[PDB]
Assembly symmetry: D3
Homo-oligomer: 269 residues x 6
């Protein structure tokens, strides 16, 4: 089906692969449209319980596909293009945050500009020890976007966000982990496999509860406590009404205990 990205649905995971390895996996306008499409479809698929965004080969995503920028048609040309890709970049970004599925960013290589935006917009993020993160905007002479003014500070605090953007420094895995930018780091050679198992475990876990958590996290950052608890309680009520409930309860009371977390992230490095 898709012609600009890799995609598959297997074992409950809708896996989207950014695919333009020769150009570091930068995202073309058509690919972005496909990514948005695939997210829409994932959310509409009862068989899908989670989404995985990863890059082909050794790069995650190098951001804007600079080579699509028309040089043959003046300022207007350049602008008209940006308007177009900007639209798509954002439709895509918003979707990752709004989609009714947990989204895992398996950062397998470099993430720059929009690629970093992607990793920040996702719900969970893990990376290879060979990965790296860089804003890149300030270097190419373009204003920051891809929701970086939303997501970054929400994850690393205002100061670190500011620093990264202003210095255009490259953030390595250890530091990214420390920052909370990634949860775990895994050896390059084992990454794919690790990431694929995490994805499947996220898919297998109860989507309903996951979505409740995800939407409340985004909403609650900006709301007062009493407003947060009202939407939280609505979820509670809905959740105890759902068929998934009683069985969990009975199992607890019966003496069953889980020998492992819902989603296991191995220690990594």
């Amino acid at each position: 089906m898709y012609e600009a990205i890799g995609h598959r649905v297997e074992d409950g995971v809708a896996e989207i692969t950014i695919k333009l390895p020769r150009h570091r996996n930068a995202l073309s306008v058509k690919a972005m449209q496909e990514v948005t499409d695939a997210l829409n479809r994932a959310e509409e698929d009862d068989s899908v319980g989670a989404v995985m965004i990863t890059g082909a080969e050794d790069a995650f995503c190098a951001g804007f596909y600079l080579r699509e920028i028309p040089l043959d048609k003046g300022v207007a040309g350049v602008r008209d293009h940006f308007r177009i890709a900007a639209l798509w970049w954002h439709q895509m970004i918003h979707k990752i945050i709004r989609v009714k599925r947990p989204v895992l960013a398996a950062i397998n290589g470099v993430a720059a500009g929009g690629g970093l935006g992607i990793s920040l917009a996702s719900d969970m993020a893990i990376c290879a020890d060979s990965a790296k993160f860089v804003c890149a905007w300030h270097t190419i002479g373009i204003g920051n976007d891809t929701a970086t003014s939303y997501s970054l500070a929400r994850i690393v605090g205002m100061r670190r966000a500011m620093e990264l953007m202003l210095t255009d420094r490259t953030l390595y895995p250890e530091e990214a982990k420390d920052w909370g930018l990634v949860s775990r780091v895994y050896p390059k050679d084992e990454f794919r496999e690790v990431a694929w198992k995490v994805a499947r475990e996220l898919a297998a876990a109860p989507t309903h509860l996951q979505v409740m958590a995800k939407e409340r996290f985004h909403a609650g950052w900006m709301q007062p406590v009493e407003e947060c608890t009202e939407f939280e309680i609505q979820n509670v009520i809905a959740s105890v009404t759902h068929p998934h409930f009683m069985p969990c309860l009975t199992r607890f009371l019966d003496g069953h205990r889980a020998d492992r977390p819902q989603v296991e992230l191995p220690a990594g490095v």
Copy 2:
């Protein structure tokens, strides 16, 4: 007086103990009502300078009291119980956050679900080396609440908040501290004493200024700088008019440094 909680007021500290050790200090509907009452009372007691919440024995609070959920009244019976419990759990959580007293969560053991919510709603938190934290909602099949959509990310950032909720893994003291969930960790055997001493200091410190700081912190998170300052200024003017001020100014002019601590947190482990 209270029949489902432990309570005592000494040395300027109103100490609330979650008490149902046989059931890991899970919080009953009756108990939650008593905690709120106790919180209201503390705020009205001139002799109380701080509140401390802790658990009996070796557990902090196991969250929802699952054993009081009706099982012989259908989904309706279930739904009904949760509506009630939910009202009281949130009236309590909100009270911890709005109470005109600094609240120290002395986490002496496991804190799960609503127990973790309590920990996160408090103003300060310290724990024993044997304590542990877990979301647990998902495992039991319930949507998350107890203000986790408000408090968690405000403390650990959105990424870590999402992670903990989604994986449902157990967070241990060292990591909790690293995340900002607890300020310090103490050996189990020294914990109680250490905590009482911290509570006393908090109690002895200037309540009026504490309340100003507490309210401003909650409010300011969501306000633009110019509005925050207006409210801060109103507090400044009120504080320099309060009788507490002059004498401090005097001491300072007389060589006593303002870097003197109000509360001494021992290093711990």
Copy 3:
């Protein structure tokens, strides 16, 4: 010339020096007013690309100049002083956050009360290994201000913000860095020079782009994603329309983006 602060403009950097060394660089009402003026001027100056705030000597800023407080006019005299002082302090704190230039806080030493406030309001912050931070408000007996109810938790999260204020604990460099309060720590001896290098770089960096990011960061903290992106897009369009654009592109294209704009030495 200013009378209450130090002020240098070099290599596109307008350096503001808090200067009242005998009294730990506490900020007097006059000084505050000059800081704000210096801010406005910097932004007005096409030559200036960055602003650096630092203290004279070995101290950053001890906060409110308590020795300015009138004691011969009763409570009302106290109150009146604080009203004027509060006005100026906040006009200045606001400026730092709103000014159309990147602001580097070079914390050469102790930062207390309003001095910490200054530290938190700045866009970037680095300190000398001999620096320290303390709230002070709770001991001096004054309600917290200088936008601490805005900036502290934004930088260190709610729990740490609350702790710091309530305990009146002093924060040393290692912890400050860990907390995100400062990006790097440097040896007292190498400090000023490191700081100047950084500042120079920031200055050279593309100002327009820096402002976009700055403004966006402050605004976005409180906005839903779809509103954030509308503002980011506007910036994007404006930027690709600006002269600075093509050459960067062309260059990238040509062979010449992961290149650091501002090098921040690892320090200690």
Copy 4:
């Protein structure tokens, strides 16, 4: 079933009647709890399409039930009663606003204090020509509540809201209508019938779309346009997937105009 309110469900309408005529329909703590319960029940009744709140006889609701305030227990007794009553008054007010059903306030007489709060929290309001509205808080010496700080200005603008609260004057039907406080006024003798008919229409109209509109209105007041649209879009997509849609599209394509009313409000006086 209920002992302090009148209640009935007919023709798709759950009708809640504030009933304490001898005391001008002031709302007792017991009564308020019943109203909330009734609201919860309506939202869960497939056969209820709308809720109508009105008063017995010739008064709508005189607000706080002043005669149940303890007088032989000091300020404490007073304070205690108000904390309780306050919890229940707000649980009810919030429920009117959050309930997943359109709520019509059929103001058949005076609405004072909390009575006016009820009127303002409802989704739609109409009144008899003999109705009247008054803040009353100040006269009785109490700070205003019942969400007047939320609802009043959202309906009449800040100036008129301030004015009414500060002057404490009685607003009559014509002015109320002019202010937007009521949509229409009807002769006392025709009121009840007119209101039941309006309620039935509201009940018969598409609840799902009503709820979408209601929630969006409350939320959107405080949200920027791009966020509002995202949520509106999610509703659009859900509504065109709902079975209700196709048949309407069909009718329209078959010449039936979308200007057909869902609810017919008679001119009144």
Copy 5:
């Protein structure tokens, strides 16, 4: 040239005409896209000082072009169409509110669903005595959109907004004016001309100042007073620094401010 809409640029006014008269000026996906483009262009054109949105003939805009809905692809086909359509409709609604030009909505006739949305999103609105407004959403069976959850209550208050949507009542000009939905009402016959005059004036009015006000109004609705004033101040400074300033001053000073910028005939 556009293919789905009418588009005139005269006397600094870029006039956008919704044009699908056979179908009551419903907006097709193509058309939407052109409206947005026309918006961008207007803002890009130093010659254009205002934008006017109106409908062809006797109708303003009947909303969603329901005849574009695919019926041969099942539910999914429906859904897919609406996803694309929703995208375009909102990109356009947003533009109207965000565009850096004043936007006048000249409601020459019926405005339903998205057409009302358009009406609400515009900066100013006037209608012909033959116009009318109706939500339509609740009868057509579609959840409300086109920013109605944003703009309606902002204009008419929560109670009236809710009523209108829930009853699906049609609003005639007298009421619309009373409600604040339109500023003036004019005879069908004099309409277009009145509208053009107004538009021309808006166009001539100082654009920079108009944008400042527009942006501020949208932003301020949700901000505390001290943040509002910071943004208003910035605008003030920018404006007194702009060429346009002095002459106005000088003039005032000289003898030549209560003079109407845009005359709005009393109409009926």
Copy 6:
């Protein structure tokens, strides 16, 4: 005392008179400072129960004092001036909205630019039949300020606000009243007297309750209902604790009834 404005405290009212009649009462930088001062003092004066802002003679306030603008010193000069007056204009505006006293704007003549800002910032507004309102900004070539982007729409709705600013039209009393911009209009010859009596009645009414209402109105416009009710309840509790309370209650129960509103605004014209 003051040298640039008229001022007096009498019968519980702190009356501030803008005084520069030759220049239509435009506000000079020094006067603005005095106004702010007088507001500060009013709030600190136990004898003051309300504030009245009015203009001298036949003009209310013509706004910025254009004649203070330096022409002898280039762009910089003009800018430096604006920076200064802007600061004061806003300190003043904010104060009217934040001051712990009800503020009545007795608009006795023309209100332009900042003068209109003043009338919008006040808590209650009434005018003479000879008064008029005009933005004026767009005409003098200056961006709108004085909190017009806060206050106007809050009072008249977004459309009317936009219109007024964009057209720079002059709004007459009848229309201003209709808009909710003023509550009442009185004949020029009786205005002063009417306004003076309203002021005294606002002063005589319970300041504590007035402030509660005022602050909650400004805050609540932007807050969700559950957050609004929490601050509302805090006021309730405080109010029933206050000595003013019991007496009101007892009087009610005893059979006393007020023969008039707290603050009587006569019908006017």
